[PDB]
């Protein structure tokens, strides 16, 4: 029997290094194709989306989200904590000015 | 000596006649005419700058009312563009219907 259970928080450092070195999108295309379709229904119905329009919306949306999480992390390391939490996300948005 | 006088042009008579319909009884000090005449010149350079890009993207060469109306729908926020697209539509309807 070899449990080989790496201690908590050491599998993730290997995960961070491998993920930061590749460019493939991390949210699946079929589910995202629908979230845009639902948020478009209210503005007008009978709107037909070309293939590129869903792709651009995926690259901008991943990029806003990747960033908010590098600023939430910077705020967490300030309070002496090492983990992101719900309260930290709201200091980053008040300071950046989005409100 | 004689004449040789430039004529500065300002929308200040027209902001002392909208204070005489909304609130008869009150008067504006000279500084407030400053902080107002610099507002009218800032929402006229953000509706003639999103209407000279909309004309060109669509490959057309005239700013008709629809174009000065797409800008109000985009630049102004909610409960401000709604109470403004209607105000214009009644005001242009009078121009054509009534001569």
């Amino acid at each position: 029997k070899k449990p080989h259970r790496y201690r908590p928080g050491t599998v993730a450092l290997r995960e961070i290094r491998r993920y930061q070195k590749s460019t493939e999108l991390l949210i699946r295309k079929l589910p995202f194709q629908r979230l845009v379709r639902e948020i478009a229904q209210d503005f007008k119905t009978d709107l037909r989306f070309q293939s590129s329009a869903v792709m651009a919306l995926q690259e901008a949306c991943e990029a806003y989200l990747v960033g908010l999480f590098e600023d939430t992390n910077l705020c967490a390391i300030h309070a002496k904590r090492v983990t992101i939490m719900p309260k930290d996300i709201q200091l980053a948005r008040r300071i950046r000015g989005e409100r | 000596k004689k004449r040789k006088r430039s004529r500065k042009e300002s929308y200040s008579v027209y902001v002392y006649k909208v204070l005489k319909q909304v609130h008869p009884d009150t008067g504006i000090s000279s500084k407030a005419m400053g902080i107002m005449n610099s507002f009218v010149n800032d929402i006229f350079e953000r509706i003639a700058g999103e209407a000279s890009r909309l004309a060109h993207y669509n490959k057309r060469s005239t700013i008709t009312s629809r174009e000065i109306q797409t800008a109000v729908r985009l630049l102004l926020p909610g409960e401000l563009a709604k109470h403004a697209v209607s105000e214009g539509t009644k005001a242009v309807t009078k121009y054509t219907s009534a001569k």
Binding site: - | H23, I35, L80
Partner: protein, 119 residues
């Protein structure tokens, strides 16, 4: 030249509808201005000058004065949510700031006794 009727009056708008045509044409915004555009753009400026100049007078009676001075302009464009999301980067000339003290630091509250020798 038979008689003179202002183009503003025929559409019943107080803000000029003749001046906005020259300024649109001589700023090189576009080649041909059109004639349904000077009138629409002299009415989306007048509604806005009648929102700041009425939410500011109402804040002058409250402070007991009869003139809309520069500060009374900030207490009216830093409250309304629609007008603080448009003029959200602008800085008024001598405006001041809107009163707000965060609750955590208010006097005592947690009570400055510290060691409180006793219990």
């Amino acid at each position: 030249r038979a008689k003179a009727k202002t183009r503003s009056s025929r559409a019943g708008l107080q803000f000029p509808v003749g001046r906005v045509h020259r300024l649109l044409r001589k700023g090189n915004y576009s080649e041909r201005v059109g004639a349904g555009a000077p009138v629409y753009l002299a009415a989306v400026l007048e509604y806005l000058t009648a929102e700041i100049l009425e939410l500011a007078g109402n804040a002058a009676r409250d402070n007991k004065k009869t003139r809309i001075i520069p500060r009374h302009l900030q207490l009216a464009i830093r409250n309304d949510e629609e007008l603080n999301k448009l003029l959200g980067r602008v800085t008024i000339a001598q405006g001041g700031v809107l009163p707000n003290i965060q609750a955590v630091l208010l006097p005592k509250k947690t009570e400055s006794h510290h060691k409180a020798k006793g219990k």
